[PDB]
Amino acid sequence: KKTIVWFRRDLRIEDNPALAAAAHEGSVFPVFIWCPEEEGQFYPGRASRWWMKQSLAHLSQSLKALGSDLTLIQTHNTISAILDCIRVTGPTKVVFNHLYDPVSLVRDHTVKEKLVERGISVQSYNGDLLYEPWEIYCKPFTSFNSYWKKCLDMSIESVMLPPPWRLMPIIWACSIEELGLENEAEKPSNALLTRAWSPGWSNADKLLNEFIEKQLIDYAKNSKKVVGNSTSLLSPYLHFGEISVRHVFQCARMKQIIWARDKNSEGEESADLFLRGIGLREYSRYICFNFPPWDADVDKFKAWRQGRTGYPLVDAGMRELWATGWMHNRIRVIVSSFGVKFLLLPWKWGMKYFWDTLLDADLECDILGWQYISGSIPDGHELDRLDNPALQGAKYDPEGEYIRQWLPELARLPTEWIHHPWDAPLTVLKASGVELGTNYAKPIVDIDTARELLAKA
Amino acid sequence: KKTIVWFRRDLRIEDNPALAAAAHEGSVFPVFIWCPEEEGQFYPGRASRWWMKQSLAHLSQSLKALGSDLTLIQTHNTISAILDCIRVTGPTKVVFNHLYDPVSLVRDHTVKEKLVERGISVQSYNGDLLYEPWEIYCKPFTSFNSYWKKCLDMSIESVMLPPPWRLMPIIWACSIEELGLENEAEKPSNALLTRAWSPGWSNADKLLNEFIEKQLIDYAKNSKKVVGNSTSLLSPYLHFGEISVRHVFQCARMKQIIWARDKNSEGEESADLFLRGIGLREYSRYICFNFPPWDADVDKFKAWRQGRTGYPLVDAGMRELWATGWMHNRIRVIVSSFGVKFLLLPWKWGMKYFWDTLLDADLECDILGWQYISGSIPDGHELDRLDNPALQGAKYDPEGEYIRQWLPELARLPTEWIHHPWDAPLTVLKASGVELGTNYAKPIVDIDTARELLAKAISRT
């Protein structure tokens, strides 16, 4: 009759089973408990912490519009802090939504154990997945398409809950600044991100609406350019659960149904392709549940993260990542595949840098991504294949516009050579304003010698 | 495992509990059973039937795209038809969504009582109401003000069901034409409604999105304007259940929450007024379920339904109704109140005529509007007040554009007189090109006469 609602990475009021459950069985005490030393090695990066702060404030003022507050707590032990919430609130139950990362797994367990030890009941809900990673079983599911063909033959009839109509409310609590989510010196450079992004669940709704109604129809061809923000841009919102992925899946399947009826074959395959992405976020939770000779050269690492490799697609991507906190999925493949296969940087460096600059930085997806670009996951591009920037150029940036947007020094380079300038003839380079080594970098390593120092093993 | 899904007035594949449940349990056999003889006094009107015919086709091709089909049967006895489906399909259960009109209540009870006897499973579901008429109680209310917020103080939160994944398929069968929903002579006149209206659940969806995203914000003021189609225009879709009132309600409350938190005061006001509309529809079913000289004149009636009364708000209203199958709510008040308090026609004559020309013709909403007009209900229009056309016009058509659009012969009448031309000085009527009795009808009843008869009716209670 008096429940605590533990928010973690489900910062929304719509289709939130935990909050819904608690709101219906009675009064609720919503809380967010930050415990850095317990996240340890999985402490969220700089950009992810900045987004978190924004949408925590967004979610908090939403809850007061409904009649409750958001209590924030920063502490050294999570159960310690939880128990005092029970002390001051006299509640009987604690609810939360499952996360699947290693840290929350041990903790959600350790907090279920210690809590029912004292007669207070705990019940967690699935707030982030169409299918929990233990519900779809066997030959193996070592693939993604075996996995995704299985779920699409299993019903997806799980239903979606409205936001609670009202919330009846009920210390070492603190404010949002007091959580320490930003560092003082990085604050103004962080604020610049608001010019590309407005976190919070109400914005998540607005974004999903315009995407489904206007952009989804073109997803299958827009999503192959890397220029512009050609895909949905939902990933940060999905990571913080500011939008229920069930809502995302169902809105998209409504279109697929209508487009299938009305024999609009392009919209059909658009909806097919886009839902595959949603399934990849699923498989990410699936594999991370069931399957728990480096050049340690910091200068090389610095050239990589600053975009001075001489590889335009790479340099552009790193510039976009630094400026916006986001990059198209194929740019993620290109730059990471560049960090390890071309520069032979240790992957912990590259992954740690994605961790600290990606707004959608997400343990399971980011893991699955690095495992793809290194031939680890059985369905990932083998390591010996070192693909040609020119060919990458023709398929994802066929008019050179991505380069010309992020690397304006190269604006007068003809498209035939804008993705591999070291191969153009010299009169072509002088005709463009391009002096390799002076105003754009020389290829930091030549593609051909990197080709065969990689075949070494 | 093998289930008959009986469609009646729920022509949609989303948030459709009977459809969702059956598909979850196994194979399904959707049917629509048309039996005019059982409908009786309540046979649907010409415009409703035209809409139903479009919608059924829309539904039929949807369910095919999903892997099943919609079978259409026209019969003399519904109970019969259902049994022969069963005998052929060999299924073990039948499901449907509740309806609340007195034909449906008796037919539903009779159908359930006879399938039960033959060992057939039957389950019915709430697919048209936020709350069913037996879930709100104190004894019953009779004032909407207290019914609605007795609702709002309660758990106004119901789950939304996704459309079925896929439908696994399995007589007197016939096509939509052979249902006979149109009369051959009326078909071209009917086909002109596609002018203005696109029936079907997916069109309902498109329209709802457009309303919440771009229109709802302004509804509080737009709902003041009888000209244009300034409200949402969801009513036909709601009446046929092509869109779920639960969906509709949730989308509006979502915006209401955004605007209340962001302290957009204009949008808050629109949202609660719009939900008041949904509450009114809800109240219609609560009232009819729980609560089951004045001289006629065949020629006054014809002048009324043809729009030759000399009351421009009334005549424009009937022009618009006949041309589009729809009219703003306050025009509905004005012409029905005119039918009743000015012409003293039998109130059923007015309801039957709405019943034949409203596309959204709805038994419970229509009963509710005519009863608020005849002041049968407590917070209804007290039988004493008399319309003042000039004030009506000032409020709902403050610039005369409703009249000038539907009654163009009055275009050059100045706004301060366009709603009550019998009051303008002769000189002003001639400056406009307006000759009452020639150009535009004299008021078929003098308003002072109506007032004087009303006043003698009141000094006898």
Ligand SMILES: Cc1cc2nc3c(=O)[nH]c(=O)nc-3n(C[C@H](O)[C@H](O)[C@H](O)COP(=O)(O)OP(=O)(O)OC[C@H]3O[C@@H](n4cnc5c(N)ncnc54)[C@H](O)[C@@H]3O)c2cc1C
């Ligand atoms: C090295 C590498 C690292 C990556 N790190 C992350 C990360 O930290 N956080 C993150 O959310 N995604 C990550 N991805 C996946 C992908 O690049 C992004 O999800 C996508 O670009 C985000 O933009 P979007 O919302 O417009 O994608 P859309 O094409 O519009 O897809 C819609 C949603 O479906 C999911 N999705 C789509 N593609 C994938 C995919 N390949 N893998 C997993 N989920 C997918 C995402 O939640 C995405 O938001 C990584 C990929 C690679 C190769």
Ligand SMILES: Cc1cc2nc3c(=O)[nH]c(=O)nc-3n(C[C@H](O)[C@H](O)[C@H](O)COP(=O)(O)OP(=O)(O)OC[C@H]3O[C@@H](n4cnc5c(N)ncnc54)[C@H](O)[C@@H]3O)c2cc1C
């Ligand atoms: C004499 C009279 C007869 C009427 N006959 C019908 C009818 O046959 N079928 C019908 O659906 N409505 C009827 N109404 C109610 C109202 O006029 C219409 O529902 C409304 O004009 C339809 O257009 P809309 O959807 O754009 O209104 P909106 O303001 O956009 O309302 C949204 C929904 O709320 C419901 N609603 C709104 N207002 C009312 C109301 N006063 N009473 C009941 N429900 C309401 C309707 O389902 C409507 O579709 C009648 C009203 C009167 C006074």
